[PDB]
Write a protein that holds these residues in place. Structure first.
Motif, PDB file in Angstrom:
ATOM      1  N   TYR A   1       0.836  -1.190   0.000  1.00 46.75           N
ATOM      2  CA  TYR A   1       0.000   0.000   0.000  1.00 46.75           C
ATOM      3  C   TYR A   1       0.875   1.245   0.000  1.00 46.75           C
ATOM      4  CZ  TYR A   1      -3.807  -3.137   1.399  1.00 46.75           C
ATOM      5  OH  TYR A   1      -4.733  -4.153   1.455  1.00 46.75           O
ATOM      6  N   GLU A   2       0.494   2.232  -0.812  1.00 49.58           N
ATOM      7  CA  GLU A   2       1.163   3.527  -0.757  1.00 49.58           C
ATOM      8  C   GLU A   2       0.820   4.286   0.517  1.00 49.58           C
ATOM      9  OE1 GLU A   2      -0.125   5.651  -4.188  1.00 49.58           O
ATOM     10  OE2 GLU A   2      -2.139   6.050  -3.413  1.00 49.58           O
ATOM     11  N   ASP A   3      -0.268   3.911   1.192  1.00 51.07           N
ATOM     12  CA  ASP A   3      -0.649   4.510   2.470  1.00 51.07           C
ATOM     13  C   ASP A   3      -1.427   3.441   3.233  1.00 51.07           C
ATOM     14  OD1 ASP A   3      -2.388   6.042   4.449  1.00 51.07           O
ATOM     15  OD2 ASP A   3      -1.148   7.672   3.662  1.00 51.07           O
TER      16      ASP A   3
END
Lengths: 51, 50
Positions: free
Chosen positions: B48-50
């Motif tokens: 996940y990017e965040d």
């Protein structure tokens, strides 16, 4: 194993221990097993189409 | 899913997270029926990017 409803092949041992049946999608083969692990080549693999 | 939710909940409670995969598929009658398969955290690496 997790996400299947039916197996691909099933090896079944008879309740008397004398025959071994291998099941497939459409047919099952019955083998005569006198001794555990002994499958004589003289016997003929009977093929039954359950369908 | 009535039974696979049990496995999904077990994985989420044990490892702290769990995944379910929704991929396109076709039902017996046709049309469009997606298939949902619970995925163990030990078999998926999600980034996940965040």
């Amino acid at each position: 194993q997790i996400n299947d409803e039916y197996p691909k092949y099933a090896l079944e041992l008879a309740n008397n221990g004398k025959t071994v049946r291998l099941y497939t999608d459409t047919d099952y083969y019955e083998l005569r097993m006198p001794s555990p692990g002994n499958f004589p080549n003289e016997q003929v693999i009977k093929k039954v189409h359950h369908g | 899913m009535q039974s696979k939710q049990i496995a999904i909940h077990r994985a989420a409670l044990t490892y702290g997270y769990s995944y379910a995969r929704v991929l396109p598929g076709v039902a017996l009658d046709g049309a469009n029926q997606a298939e949902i398969h619970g995925v163990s955290p030990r078999r998926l690496l999600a980034l996940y990017e965040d």
